[PDB]
Each structure stands twice: as structure tokens, then as C-alpha cells.
């Protein structure tokens, strides 16, 4: 719950759109 990488409250890290 919440993006490991990027902080943002949405999506999982692994293929995050960052
Ligand atoms: Zn992210």
C-alpha cells in the first residue's frame, strides 16, 4: 500500500510510471 519508490498513493513500485 503506497509506492515503495516514489511515495505516491496509488500504485506499486515495480512498474511505477515515474
Ligand atoms: Zn510510483
As given in the structure block, the three cell numbers for residue 3 are 509506492
The DSSP call for residue 13 is G
C-alpha torsion sign, points 8, 11, 12, 16:
negative
- Within 10 angstroms of residue 3's Cβ, the number of other Cβ atoms is 16
CB 16 within 8 A of CB 7: no
CB 7 within 8 A of CB 17: no
Q: How far apart are the C-alpha atoms of 6 and 15, rounded to whole Å?
A: 11
Cα dist from 13 to 2, 4, whole Å: 8, 5
CB 5 within 8 A of CB 11: no
Q: How was this structure determined?
A: NMR
CB 18 within 8 A of CB 6: yes
Number of residues that make up the chain: 18
Please give the distance, rounded to the nearest whole angstrom, from the Cα atom of residue 6 to the centre of ligand 1.
Answer: 4
Please give the distance, rounded to the nearest whole angstrom, from the Cα atom of residue 14 to the centre of ligand 1.
Answer: 8
Amino acid at each position: 500500500v503506497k509506492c515503495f519508490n516514489c511515495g505516491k498513493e496509488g500504485h506499486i513500485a515495480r512498474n511505477c510510471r515515474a
